[PDB]
Symmetry: C2
Subunit: 439 residues, 2 copies
């Protein structure tokens, strides 16, 4: 005898708890390794953003931030000299303090992956972190980022270093000059991971030649396997992603959800405007993805560009609620209506989906977007929120409420360690969002 | 203006062909590299089986088979001596003949990946294959399998070599003895791929230390990226996979398709029998996967083992046909009924799925099954056919017709280069398959 949970709709055995109900109440440390300005922090933040979005709780422990709080105002690379005994001691205390927080996150706060982001360039420091992992029952996975192209190091410095709080009192050439001296502090004592000898037994990936060569050693589980796959499909060349919904469609005009209706006459004006907009972006090659529902495909046909249909991009399935208006939902399914409002990410429609299901189904879209250059994705409201949450690092709880009005393009471009979003409304009227009607 | 295709249900622009209708009517060579008995052929066949099942047409060109047809009866390793000028010449003609067939497969027969399976141990031979790829516009991807553990080489020989047609006239110790001499023929001239120098520019993966270490260089596209991910998640340790359907359920008794009904009283007897059967298999640790539909979960609850629910394992979605009987389908949707019978793999139910959709949605299940040891999967008829087609290398056209009766376990175990299937019927009656009723 089983019962279906109210919110997620999962069949679970009836828990006829005895009259004294009893209640029951292996984590990984990813260790970044590498010289400064090699992308460690960029990898840490973007990996975490991916892991959290697919539902693995992950947190970055950036030792550099523990050092910023402990010292206040960075003045120069002198702080990083190997002969600076006081600073060496502060640096090691910053690392140990970050490790206490790692311990707490993984063993007490429900975290599953802690990304320990520091140079970690000596065997002796990595040996200590492994002792920490062994003593707490954490697994350890090392990601070493290796970069021997001065062009790329210089560009990293310009993109994320010179504008750091460290270089507050500094202009660009002097910041750049200081950082280069900082880097050279680490060179004498740097000991790269060596999987053929001393590091034979560590689980690790070395990212080399600007994400071009990988060495992967002893992947241990499912999550490490996903990490490596991810790291092997990201790249740093700047590009643009555009996201929008299909033009207004006939179910939009009747306030009916889901279905597979066609563009209204304003939806087709949007589709023309979108065509005009794409042309003035003036982009080299632009890939166009749609879902398999009619109104996104009509919208792409207005563009006269080749496009590709993905069933993974189709709107969230409303199950028994498909093609009902919001009032017919409230009046036939008051219980269901109210539960959804209470827990909108986890809620699943009967015989339908939740935002949480959407996430799993969009995972290959996200993986392929990482591999692309310029792409325009024409999709649907919930799909769009779910993709936007991944690029803007929004949590599960905020994802179902992100603003995505009709006839509005979202333009995502890389800056610093993330995505900037610009909204471009294409000046064609539509019925409003459901949120705006309510208030 | 768009129209929905009859079979797959894809929105496509009306093709109002002019009165003289005109009709329009980059491939990859995967190059295996390595000493004999290193798993090249096992990798070639299993990669091809994966690629074809996810819908990439792929074919193995095993030069060893071209050599078997050209020479007839292998007598000894003498054939492989580097001083055998006649045999060297035959071997090179076998390779060139396989390359002509590769050319034809990729450029004329619609193939997309040709796996060129031969030792290819010298730079000079790999340079020629690259010339072949460059001259035909094929991309080239190299997979080198490196094995330095005599235990594993010996075991490969026992598992697939001694029983070869080559060793027809031979017993085991002498076959093993001959093969070792064969291997040592290749050692003086063997030149491993070297990505840090001479092979910097090749796209390749070296599989080392029994699938434990990888070196990956210059992945170029989507398909290569999927290959590498796959190769990094397969392993050779023997295990068992069991597949079955849920016990008979109440929609089974009424001949109604889909839905989410519970076990009938015979379904619950099956579930007990399944519990008894699992216990007598006497397996170390056994993972149990179910779908999120009730009757598979009830079936697993009879086992008193921990299980994991996957929404990817849910039955194919019948769309408007959900919960109809086969006669109500025939009588309300005669057009739809008949199309499905005509093209059962590609056919999609209105607002529902096809076997082809099932495949994409099961891809992560297949990837995780590769990583597992002993696993029992309790699922549904179409899901089961789709997984069985992957393990038994059945084509898309045969997949929807594979026999999967109720109350029957399929036990899959590794032999030689594939999976043996044994059927174990657990002696509990159920309504019959729909195929059996019809005839």
């Amino acid at each position: 005898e089983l019962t279906q949970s109210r919110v997620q709709k999962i069949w679970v055995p009836v828990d006829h708890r005895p009259s004294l109900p009893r209640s029951c109440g292996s984590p990984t440390v990813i260790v970044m390794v590498g010289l400064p300005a090699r992308g460690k922090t960029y990898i840490s933040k973007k990996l975490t953003r991916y892991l959290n979005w697919i539902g693995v709780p992950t947190k970055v422990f950036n030792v550099g931030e523990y050092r910023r709080e402990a010292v206040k105002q960075y003045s120069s690379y002198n702080f990083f000299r190997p002969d600076n005994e006081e600073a060496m001691k502060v640096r090691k205390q910053c690392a140990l303090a970050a490790l206490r927080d790692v311990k707490s996150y993984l063993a007490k706060e429900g975290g599953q992956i802690a990304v320990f982001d520091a140079t970690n360039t000596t065997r002796e420091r990595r040996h200590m972190i492994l002792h920490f992992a062994k003593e707490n029952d954490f697994k350890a996975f090392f990601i070493e980022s290796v970069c021997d192209d001065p062009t790329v190091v210089a560009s990293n410095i310009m993109e994320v270093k010179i504008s750091s709080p460290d270089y507050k009192d500094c202009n660009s050439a002097e910041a750049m000059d200081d950082f280069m001296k900082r880097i050279s502090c680490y060179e004498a004592s740097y000991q790269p991971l060596d999987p053929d000898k001393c590091d034979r037994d560590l689980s690790l990936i070395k990212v080399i030649d600007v994400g071009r060569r990988f060495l992967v050693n002893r992947v241990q589980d499912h999550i490490q396997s996903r990490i490596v796959y991810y790291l092997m499909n990201i790249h740093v060349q700047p590009r643009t992603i555009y996201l929008c919904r299909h033009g207004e469609n006939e179910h939009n005009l009747q306030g009916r959800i889901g279905g597979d209706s066609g563009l209204s006459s304003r939806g087709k004006k949007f589709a023309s405007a979108l065509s005009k907009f794409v042309e003035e972006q003036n982009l080299k090659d632009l890939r166009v993805w749609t879902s398999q529902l009619k109104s996104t495909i009509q919208t792409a046909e207005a563009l006269r560009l080749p496009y590709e249909q993905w069933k993974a991009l189709n709107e969230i399935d409303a199950g028994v609620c498909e093609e009902l208006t919001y009032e017919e939902i409230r009046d036939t399914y008051p219980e269901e209506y109210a539960l959804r409002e209470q827990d909108k990410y986890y809620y699943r429609y009967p015989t339908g989906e939740s935002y949480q299901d959407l996430v799993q189904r969009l995972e290959p879209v996200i993986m392929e977007l990482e591999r692309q250059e310029n792409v325009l994705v024409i999709c649907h409201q919930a799909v769009l929120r779910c993709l936007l949450a991944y690029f803007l690092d929004k949590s599960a709880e905020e994802m179902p409420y992100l603003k995505c009005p009709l006839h509005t393009v979202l333009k995502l471009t890389p800056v610093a360690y993330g995505c900037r979003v610009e909204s471009i409304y294409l000046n064609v009227e539509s019925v409003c969002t459901h949120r705006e009607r309510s208030e």
